[PDB]
Design a protein around this motif. Structure first.
Motif, short mmCIF file in Angstrom:
data_model
loop_
_atom_site.label_atom_id
_atom_site.label_comp_id
_atom_site.label_asym_id
_atom_site.label_seq_id
_atom_site.Cartn_x
_atom_site.Cartn_y
_atom_site.Cartn_z
N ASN A 245 -3.20 -3.89 -12.09
CA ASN A 245 -2.72 -3.41 -13.38
C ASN A 245 -1.79 -2.23 -13.16
O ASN A 245 -1.87 -1.56 -12.12
CB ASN A 245 -3.88 -2.99 -14.29
N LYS A 246 -0.91 -1.98 -14.13
CA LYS A 246 0.09 -0.92 -13.98
C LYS A 246 -0.54 0.46 -14.14
O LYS A 246 -0.12 1.42 -13.49
CB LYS A 246 1.21 -1.12 -14.99
N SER A 247 -1.56 0.57 -15.00
CA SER A 247 -2.03 1.89 -15.42
C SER A 247 -2.79 2.60 -14.30
O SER A 247 -2.88 3.83 -14.29
CB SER A 247 -2.91 1.76 -16.66
N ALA A 248 -3.33 1.85 -13.34
CA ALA A 248 -4.06 2.48 -12.25
C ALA A 248 -3.12 3.02 -11.19
O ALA A 248 -3.41 4.04 -10.55
CB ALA A 248 -5.05 1.49 -11.64
N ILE A 249 -1.97 2.37 -10.99
CA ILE A 249 -1.05 2.80 -9.94
C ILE A 249 -0.22 3.99 -10.42
O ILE A 249 0.42 4.68 -9.62
CB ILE A 249 -0.17 1.61 -9.50
N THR A 250 -0.23 4.26 -11.73
CA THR A 250 0.54 5.38 -12.26
C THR A 250 -0.18 6.71 -12.05
O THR A 250 0.42 7.70 -11.61
CB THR A 250 0.83 5.16 -13.74
N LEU A 251 -1.48 6.75 -12.35
CA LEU A 251 -2.23 8.00 -12.27
C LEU A 251 -2.49 8.41 -10.82
O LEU A 251 -2.81 9.57 -10.54
CB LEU A 251 -3.54 7.89 -13.04
N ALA A 252 -2.35 7.47 -9.89
CA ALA A 252 -2.49 7.80 -8.48
C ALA A 252 -1.21 8.42 -7.93
O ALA A 252 -1.21 8.98 -6.83
CB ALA A 252 -2.86 6.54 -7.69
N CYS A 253 -0.11 8.31 -8.67
CA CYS A 253 1.18 8.77 -8.15
C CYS A 253 1.34 10.28 -8.29
O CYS A 253 1.61 10.98 -7.31
CB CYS A 253 2.32 8.04 -8.85
N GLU A 254 1.17 10.80 -9.51
CA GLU A 254 1.38 12.23 -9.75
C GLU A 254 0.25 13.06 -9.18
O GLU A 254 0.38 14.28 -9.00
CB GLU A 254 1.56 12.50 -11.24
N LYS A 255 -0.89 12.43 -8.90
CA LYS A 255 -1.92 13.11 -8.12
C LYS A 255 -1.53 13.20 -6.65
O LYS A 255 -1.84 14.19 -5.98
CB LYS A 255 -3.26 12.39 -8.29
N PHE A 256 -0.84 12.18 -6.14
CA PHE A 256 -0.50 12.17 -4.72
C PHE A 256 0.80 12.92 -4.46
O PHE A 256 1.00 13.46 -3.36
CB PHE A 256 -0.39 10.74 -4.20
N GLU A 257 1.71 12.94 -5.43
CA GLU A 257 3.02 13.54 -5.19
C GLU A 257 2.93 15.06 -5.14
O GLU A 257 3.64 15.72 -4.37
CB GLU A 257 4.01 13.11 -6.28
N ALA A 258 2.03 15.64 -5.94
CA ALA A 258 1.85 17.08 -5.92
C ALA A 258 1.07 17.53 -4.70
O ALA A 258 1.28 18.64 -4.19
CB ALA A 258 1.16 17.53 -7.21
N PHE A 259 0.16 16.69 -4.22
CA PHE A 259 -0.76 17.12 -3.18
C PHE A 259 -0.15 16.95 -1.79
O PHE A 259 -0.45 17.71 -0.87
CB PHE A 259 -2.07 16.34 -3.30
N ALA A 260 0.74 15.96 -1.63
CA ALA A 260 1.23 15.61 -0.30
C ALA A 260 2.60 16.20 -0.02
O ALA A 260 2.87 16.65 1.10
CB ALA A 260 1.26 14.10 -0.13
N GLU A 261 3.49 16.20 -1.01
CA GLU A 261 4.86 16.68 -0.79
C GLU A 261 4.93 18.20 -0.86
O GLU A 261 5.60 18.83 -0.03
CB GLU A 261 5.81 16.05 -1.80
N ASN A 262 4.27 18.80 -1.84
CA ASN A 262 4.43 20.22 -2.09
C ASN A 262 3.66 21.06 -1.09
O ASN A 262 3.94 22.25 -0.91
CB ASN A 262 3.99 20.56 -3.52
N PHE A 263 2.66 20.47 -0.43
CA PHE A 263 1.80 21.29 0.42
C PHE A 263 2.22 21.25 1.89
O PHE A 263 2.57 22.29 2.46
CB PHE A 263 0.35 20.85 0.26
N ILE A 264 2.21 20.07 2.51
CA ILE A 264 2.34 20.07 3.97
C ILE A 264 3.64 19.41 4.40
O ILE A 264 4.52 20.06 4.98
CB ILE A 264 1.15 19.39 4.67
N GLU A 265 3.79 18.12 4.11
CA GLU A 265 4.81 17.30 4.76
C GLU A 265 5.67 16.59 3.73
O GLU A 265 5.38 16.60 2.53
CB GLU A 265 4.18 16.26 5.69
N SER A 266 6.74 15.98 4.22
CA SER A 266 7.63 15.20 3.38
C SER A 266 7.18 13.74 3.34
O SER A 266 6.32 13.31 4.11
CB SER A 266 9.07 15.30 3.89
N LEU A 267 7.79 12.98 2.43
CA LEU A 267 7.44 11.57 2.28
C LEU A 267 8.60 10.81 1.63
O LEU A 267 9.63 11.39 1.28
CB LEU A 267 6.15 11.38 1.46
N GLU A 268 8.40 9.51 1.48
CA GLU A 268 9.38 8.61 0.88
C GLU A 268 8.64 7.65 -0.05
O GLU A 268 7.61 7.08 0.33
CB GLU A 268 10.14 7.83 1.96
N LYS A 269 9.17 7.46 -1.26
CA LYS A 269 8.59 6.52 -2.19
C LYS A 269 9.35 5.20 -2.20
O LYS A 269 10.59 5.16 -2.19
CB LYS A 269 8.55 7.10 -3.61
#
Ligand SMILES: [Mg+2]
Ligand SMILES: [Mg+2]
Ligand SMILES: [Mg+2]
Ligand SMILES: [Mg+2]
Ligand SMILES: [Mg+2]
Ligand SMILES: [Mg+2]
Ligand SMILES: [Mg+2]
Ligand SMILES: [Mg+2]
Ligand SMILES: [Mg+2]
Ligand SMILES: [Mg+2]
Ligand SMILES: [Mg+2]
Lengths: 85, 68, 96, 210
Positions: free
Chosen positions: C9-33
């Motif tokens: 479903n679409k709604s589950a993959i959305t709430l996992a994104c802004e939880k992961f984007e703030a925790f992974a990019e802003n803190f330690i390392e870079s990434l690519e979506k």
RNA sequence: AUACCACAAGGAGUGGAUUGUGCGGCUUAAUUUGACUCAACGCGAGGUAACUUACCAAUAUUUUAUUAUUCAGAGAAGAUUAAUCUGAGAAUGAUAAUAGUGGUGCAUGGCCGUUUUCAAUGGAUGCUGUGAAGUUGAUUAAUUUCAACAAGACGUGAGACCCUUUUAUUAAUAGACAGACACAAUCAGUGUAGGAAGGAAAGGAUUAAAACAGGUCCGUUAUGCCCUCAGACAUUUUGGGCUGCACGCGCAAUACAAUAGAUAUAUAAUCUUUAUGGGAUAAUAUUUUGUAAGAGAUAUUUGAACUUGGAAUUGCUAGUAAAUUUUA
């Protein structure tokens, strides 16, 4: 028409877990306890007439649950009257 | 409207079951002293109890099937 | 470290994104979506369990959403987030 | 193509494991099941209406089911964890409301009495409307059907799919089989616990000027 | 009143030949069977060999309980290839469970189809009668929205909602509303202009009450009654069938040719100027799959009818009909 060696191999499994999974292959043996699968099913069908176990058949699989009359009977079968240690 | 198949031929008979009396006692001999004289052959993995099946070119085990 | 998201479903993959984007990019390392286009299974089947009436067909479907991340990091910096950001219905098979 | 093939196979497990609970758990009245498969203990979660009978007795039913679910999936024992919960409202569960008709019809109570009791429960629960249909051999050789409608019910489109709950059960009797169908229309609540949160597109409310 | 499952204006067909398929009859030991106007006939997702399989010709093997009788460790019933192990139940009765693609869809559920590119339907207030009961015009796909009205408001169905294609750009968000002007009123309908898109943006999916002795017991460990009980109306093995040949019908694929055929560099060049069009049927030889070919593929030869089809009848209004290609 099963032997006494494999008939106790059935009753020992019912005291620990109480449940047993049987498939519906007509020329195979069970992996947990080596009995021909047509003979093992006919053994369970004779247990039902004494009322000790109830069965459920869905999606080509057997799911059997013993009752309180069976779980009273099964641990009484292997029972030793006195143990001296 | 299936019916019984009436066969003009009779039943072909099955061979009757046989069993030789005291077949296990043949493998031992009793002396006049009371001692046992053993003639049959016991297979090397199962030397205690089982006897080897006496064939002309083969010796056969009924438990493990060892061939000699 | 190719890590992917696969959902139903679409709604589950959305709430996992802004939880992961703030925790992974802003803190330690870079990434690519990276989001992949959807894959659809089609089983055209006849409706009635007979051959009497007017013959109608029906098309069933099942959809899979795919969003992949491509991260290159140190060892424990990504693996702390697997224990921390495990969400409930979604699968996230991580390939280190 | 390969990632599509995995998701099909875990669902055929789900279809087989659902119809076991419809045969084994008539006594306590389960509402649903949920399966979590991607964790190291793969989680079977059951919503039963009466969980106080099970954990109060501490019988084998917590354990006998636990052996079967791992041996079916060929996983070893003590790798599955079964969690038991309560159901919030008994009136909104149509599986329990249809199961009560299976009990009441066996005591030779007539069908007009048994259908009249199930409408009264949901009126206390708060649903807007229900629909019960009885069908089969009711009075002899010829068969008919009788339906008993209470309240309002919507049966068209996608917003119907968020607001109804239906189920088909059958009762065997000494002459013929009788089919039983029950529908329940869920009321709105914007919390999300009791019903769907979103609103109907037909109803449009106008803010006051103030 | 309304409509390309009705005409009208148009255009490609079918019915005439050959072949692939399904129906009817007939034949045989068996050619298993359901369905018969729209609403049966390339339909049961029923495509060529063993299984599938229900038919015929033959062979081989057997679920349980209560209880009656006779056996049975001085070895029941088994497995093996007469002698070797393992070893405790068995044989015939009677009731009661189990099995059957054996009968009944005019005894049932479930799932369907048809009416139906139909639009209607339920309380409550007031009014008329002792009572059962009752409350014209325009326009829209639609009792869909208006106007007048002893009626005034509501609810269900329709609509609203959902999925696909199209313009843009932060890829999940904008963008269309009959917006604008004109055609004397409200509700509408038509024409021009700007725009990716102008009138339900285009196409689908979901889907009321109610009816049919519509189909489905040959999908089901869905089921009532009935019938059958161990060379079983069970199940397994080997061959033969469902495909046969005087003959009537429906749905389809190539054709009757210069708006064409062969060859090719695909407009290099050349040939056929009316049967070099057409490919059925058949022979010889190499060969693929399979336990098993009157089954598929290749070389050469043989080359049928057929020169546009009687009465009659099906579909179709825009990237539509028609023609040529393409995956599962
Ligand atoms: Mg509606
Ligand atoms: Mg709609
Ligand atoms: Mg013709
Ligand atoms: Mg055959
Ligand atoms: Mg049957
Ligand atoms: Mg009928
Ligand atoms: Mg009929
Ligand atoms: Mg037979
Ligand atoms: Mg049979
Ligand atoms: Mg075609
Ligand atoms: Mg030619």
């Amino acid at each position: 028409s099963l032997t006494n060696s494999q008939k106790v191999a059935v009753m020992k499994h019912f005291k620990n877990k109480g449940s047993l999974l049987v498939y519906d292959r007509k020329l195979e043996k069970n992996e947990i306890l080596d009995i021909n699968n047509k003979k093992l099913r006919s053994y369970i069908q004779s247990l039902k007439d004494q009322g000790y176990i109830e069965e459920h058949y869905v999606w080509q699989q057997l799911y059997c649950f013993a009752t309180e009359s069976g779980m009273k009977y099964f641990n009484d079968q292997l029972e030793i009257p006195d143990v001296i240690e | 409207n299936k019916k019984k198949k009436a066969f003009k031929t009779p039943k072909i008979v099955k061979p009757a079951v046989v069993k030789e009396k005291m077949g296990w006692l043949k493998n031992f001999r009793i002396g006049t002293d009371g001692s046992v004289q053993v003639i049959g052959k016991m297979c090397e993995k199962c030397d205690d109890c089982s006897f080897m099946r006496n064939m002309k070119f083969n010796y056969k085990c009924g438990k493990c099937g060892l061939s000699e | 470290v190719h890590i992917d998201i696969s959902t139903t479903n679409k709604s589950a993959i959305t709430l996992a994104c802004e939880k992961f984007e703030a925790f992974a990019e802003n803190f330690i390392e870079s990434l690519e979506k990276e989001v992949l286009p959807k894959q659809v299974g089609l089983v055209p089947t006849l409706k009635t369990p007979c051959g009497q009436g007017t013959k109608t067909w029906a098309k069933y479907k099942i959809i899979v959403h795919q969003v992949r991340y491509v991260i290159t990091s140190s060892h424990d910096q990504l693996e702390k987030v697997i224990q921390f950001l495990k969400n409930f219905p979604e699968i996230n098979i991580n390939l280190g | 193509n390969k990632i599509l093939k995995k998701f099909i196979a875990d669902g055929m497990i789900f279809a087989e494991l659902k119809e076991l609970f419809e045969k084994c758990l008539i006594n306590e009245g389960f509402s649903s099941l949920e399966l979590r498969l991607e964790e190291s203990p793969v989680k079977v979660i059951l919503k039963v209406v009466k969980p106080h009978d099970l954990i109060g007795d501490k019988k084998w039913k917590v354990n006998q089911i636990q052996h079967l679910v791992a041996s079916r999936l060929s996983l070893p024992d003590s790798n599955v964890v079964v969690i038991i919960d309560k159901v919030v409202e008994k009136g909104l569960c149509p599986i329990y409301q249809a199961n009560l008709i299976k009990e009441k019809m066996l005591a030779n109570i007539p069908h007009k009495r048994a259908a009249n009791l199930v409408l009264k429960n949901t009126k206390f629960a708060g649903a807007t409307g229900c629909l019960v249909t009885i069908s089969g051999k009711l009075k002899g050789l010829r068969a008919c059907t009788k339906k008993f409608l209470e309240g309002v019910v919507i049966k068209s489109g996608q917003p119907s799919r968020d607001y109804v709950k239906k189920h088909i059960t059958t009762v065997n009797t000494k002459q013929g089989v009788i089919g039983i169908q029950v529908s329940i229309m869920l009321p709105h609540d914007p919390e999300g616990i009791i019903g769907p949160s979103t609103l109907l597109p037909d109803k449009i409310v106008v803010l006051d000027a103030k």
